[PDB]
Amino acid sequence: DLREVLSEYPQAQTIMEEKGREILLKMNKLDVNAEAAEIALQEATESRLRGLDQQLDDLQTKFARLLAELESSALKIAYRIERLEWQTREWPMPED
Amino acid sequence: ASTNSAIINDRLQELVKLFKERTEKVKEKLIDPDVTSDEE
Amino acid sequence: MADQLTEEQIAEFKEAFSLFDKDGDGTITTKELGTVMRSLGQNPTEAELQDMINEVDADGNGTIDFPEFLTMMARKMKDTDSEEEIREAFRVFDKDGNGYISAAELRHVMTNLGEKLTDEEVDEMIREADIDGDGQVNYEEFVQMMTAK
Amino acid sequence: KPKEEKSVLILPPRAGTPKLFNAALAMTGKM
Amino acid sequence: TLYTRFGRLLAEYTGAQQKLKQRITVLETKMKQNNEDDY
Amino acid sequence: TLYTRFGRLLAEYTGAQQKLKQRITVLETKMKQNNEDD
Ligand SMILES: [Ca+2]
Ligand SMILES: [Ca+2]
Ligand SMILES: [Ca+2]
Ligand SMILES: [Ca+2]
Numbered sequence: 001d002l003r004e005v006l007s008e009y010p011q012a013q014t015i016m017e018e019k020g021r022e023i024l025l026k027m028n029k030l031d032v033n034a035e036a037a038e039i040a041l042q043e044a045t046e047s048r049l050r051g052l053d054q055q056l057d058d059l060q061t062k063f064a065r066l067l068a069e070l071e072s073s074a075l076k077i078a079y080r081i082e083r084l085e086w087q088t089r090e091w092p093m094p095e096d
Numbered sequence: 097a098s099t100n101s102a103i104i105n106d107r108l109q110e111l112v113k114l115f116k117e118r119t120e121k122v123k124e125k126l127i128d129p130d131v132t133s134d135e136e
Numbered sequence: 137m138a139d140q141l142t143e144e145q146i147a148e149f150k151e152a153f154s155l156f157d158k159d160g161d162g163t164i165t166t167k168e169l170g171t172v173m174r175s176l177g178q179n180p181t182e183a184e185l186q187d188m189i190n191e192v193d194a195d196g197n198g199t200i201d202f203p204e205f206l207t208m209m210a211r212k213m214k215d216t217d218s219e220e221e222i223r224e225a226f227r228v229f230d231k232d233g234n235g236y237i238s239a240a241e242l243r244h245v246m247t248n249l250g251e252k253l254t255d256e257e258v259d260e261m262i263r264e265a266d267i268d269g270d271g272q273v274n275y276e277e278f279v280q281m282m283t284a285k
Numbered sequence: 286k287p288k289e290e291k292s293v294l295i296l297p298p299r300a301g302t303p304k305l306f307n308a309a310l311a312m313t314g315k316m
Numbered sequence: 317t318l319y320t321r322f323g324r325l326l327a328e329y330t331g332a333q334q335k336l337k338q339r340i341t342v343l344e345t346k347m348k349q350n351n352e353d354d355y
Numbered sequence: 356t357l358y359t360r361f362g363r364l365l366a367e368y369t370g371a372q373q374k375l376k377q378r379i380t381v382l383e384t385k386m387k388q389n390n391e392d393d
Contacts, residue, residue, distance in 0.1 A: 059361060061119060062254070063318075064126065066365060067325050068118035069260050072294050073372075074332050077379055079298055081339055086301075087386060090181065094349055100225035105249055107282055112251065114295045115260070121292070126321050135320050152309055169305060176308060178393060188304055208306065256365065263369065264296070269377040284297035302390070340378060347385050 137210055138203065146206065153205045163199035164189070215283045222282050226275055237262070237273035 006013050024030035125131055141149075154160070158168050166185045173180060190196045194204060227233075231241065239262055246253060265273050265281055 055357075059357060060123060060127075062257075063361065064119040064122035065115065065257070065260070066368070067321075068122045069115075069264065070329060070368065071122075072118065072296075073264060074329065074336070076294065076296060076298070077336070077375070078332075078339075080379060080383070081343070083301055084343055084382060084386070086184070086187065088343055088346055091346060091350070094346060097224065097228075100221045101228055104222075104225055104229070104282065105245060108245075109251075111281070111295060112253070112261075115257070118295070126317070129317075132317055132320055135324060152313075156305065164305075172308060173304065176311075180304065184304075191300065192303060192305065208303075209309075212306070259369075263372065263376075267376065268380050269373055280299065281296065284299070336375070340375075340382070343382050344378065347382055350385075 137214075138206060141206070141210055149206050149209055150202070152209075153202050156205075157202075163201055164205070165199060218283055219279055222279050223275070226278050230275075235275050236270075237278070242273075 006016075021030060153164075156164055156168060156172055158171065159165070166182065166189060169185050169189065170180070170182070173185075186198065189198060189200055192204065192208060193200050194207075229241075229245070230237065232238070239258055242262065243255070243258055262271070262273055265277055267277060268274070
C-alpha cells in the first residue's frame with residue numbers, strides 16, 4: 001500500500017530510503033561493505049544492461065544491413081545475368 | 097570545379113542513407129512477431 | 137531536358153531521325169531499323185531489333201517517335217557532360233594518382249563531411265561498387281555509380 | 286488484394302548497348 | 317527470434333544461391349566452348 | 356559468441372561473394388569483345 005502511494009512521489013522515496021539507512025546504521029543493522037557489494041553488482045549490471053541494450057541494438061542495426069546488402073546485390077547480378085542471356089540464346093546448344 | 101567535388105559527396109549522401117534505409121525494411125519484417133508467427 | 141536543348145541541336149536530331157524514318161510517318165518501324173543496319177553492313181536478327189526498339193520505346197508499342205529519339209540523345213550527352221565533370225573531380229579525389237580507389241582513401245571523404253560510419257560499412261560500400269573483384273575501385277566504375285539516377 | 290512490393294534498389298540498373306544509337310554515333314564523325 | 321531468422325534468411329538466399337550457380341555455369345560452359353572455336 | 360558469429364558470417368559471405376563477383380565479370384568481358392569484331 002505504501003508502494004502504490006509512493007509511485008506518484010518519486011523524490012519522496014529517496015528521502016525515506018535515506019532515513020531508513022540512518023535508523024539501521026545507528027542500531028548497527030547495515031553493513032556498508034555488504035551493502036556496497038549489492039549496490040556495485042546492481043550498478044555494474046545496470047551499466048552492463050545498458051551496454052547490453054546497446055549490444056542488442058548495435059547487433060540488430062548492422063544485422064539487417066548484411067541481410068539487405070545481399071538481397072539487393074543478389075538481384076543486381078541476376079539483372080546482369082538476364083542481360084547476358086539474350087546473346088547466348090542465339091548461340092546453339094552444345095551436345096553435352 | 098569546387099561544385100564538382102561537392103556534388104559527388106552530395107550524390108554519395110543519398111546512397112549512404114539508402115544503405116541504412118535497407119536495414120529498417122528488413123528489420124521491420126523481422127522484429128514483427130506476426131511474421132515469426134507465420135514461420136511458427 | 138528536352139526544352140534545354142538548342143534549336144540547332146533539335147534540327148540535327150531531326151535530320152538523324154529523318155534518315156532513320158524513311159517513310160516519314162514520324163515513327164521508326166522494325167523494317168526501317170533493319171534497312172539502315174543492312175546498308176551499314178551488319179545482319180542482325182529480327183528478334184533483336186524488336187527487343188532493341190522495346191528498350192528504347194518508353195511505352196514499348198514497337199514504334200519509336202521523334203520525342204523518344206530526342207530524349208535518349210539528350211540524356212546520353214548529358215551523361216557525357218557529367219562524365220567530363222566526373223573525371224576532373226575523380227583526379228582530385230584520387231590523391232595517389234594510380235586510378236584505383238583504396239578503402240583508406242575513401243574514408244578521408246566523410247571526415248571532411250562529418251558523416252560518421254563504421255569501418256566495415258565502408259568495406260560493404262567498396263564491394264558493392266567493385267565489379268572485377270580486385271578490391272580497388274577503378275575510374276570507369278566511378279562513372280557508373282555517379283551517372284546512375 | 287495481393288500485389289508485388291516493388292522495392293527500388295540502391296544502384297540504378299544499366300542498359301544494354303543500343304544498336305540504333307551505335308549506328309548514330311558512327312556516321313556523325315563522317316558527316 | 318534471431319534463430320528463426322538464421323534459417324529464414326538463408327532459405328531465401330540459398331535457394332537463390334542454388335539457382336545462382338547453375339545459371340552462371342551454363343553461361344560459363346557455353347562461352348568456354350566458344351574458345352575452342354576461336355583457335 | 357554473438358559478436359564472433361556476427362563478424363565471421365560477414366567474413367564468410369565476403370569470401371563467397373568474391374568468387375561470385377569474379378566469374379560473372381569474365382563472362383561479360385569474353386562475349387562483348389566479339390561485338391567489336393563484327
Ligand atoms: Ca516508319
Ligand atoms: Ca512509342
Ligand atoms: Ca590510391
Ligand atoms: Ca575496380
